[PDB]
């Protein structure tokens, strides 16, 4: 019933920032909330950003916090990431998705992420 789409996802060249944007629509208003992730080949799924749903903060990993951007449309229900200073290790499928009760089982369609340096 849940999906999560992204826009302006894809190339960019090493310090070039990016701005990601996923929007979300079905029925959540419990303890949901929206983060970006990504993932590798070969290797598992990790997250990056995500934020909650009440009024306490957002959640950065210790892989590009400092450098990567978060906030929200604070109008609907949509989600903004400005990857800046980026690297070649940031280069991969960058998937939005969702919690429920301090999970995360919501994915989204995915934006693969070219850099380089």
Do not use: H
Request: proline fraction near 2%.
């Amino acid at each position: 019933q849940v999906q999560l789409q992204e826009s302006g996802g894809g190339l960019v060249q090493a310090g070039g920032s990016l701005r990601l944007s996923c929007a979300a629509s079905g029925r959540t208003g419990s303890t949901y909330d929206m983060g970006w992730f990504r993932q590798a080949p070969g290797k598992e799924r990790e997250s990056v950003a995500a934020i909650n749903w009440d009024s306490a903060r957002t959640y950065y990993a210790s892989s590009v916090r400092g450098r990567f951007t978060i906030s929200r449309d604070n109008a609907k229900k949509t989600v903004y990431l400005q990857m800046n200073s980026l690297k070649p290790e940031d280069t991969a499928v960058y998937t939005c998705g969702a919690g429920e009760g301090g999970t995360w089982d919501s994915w989204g369609q995915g934006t693969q992420v070219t850099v380089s340096s």
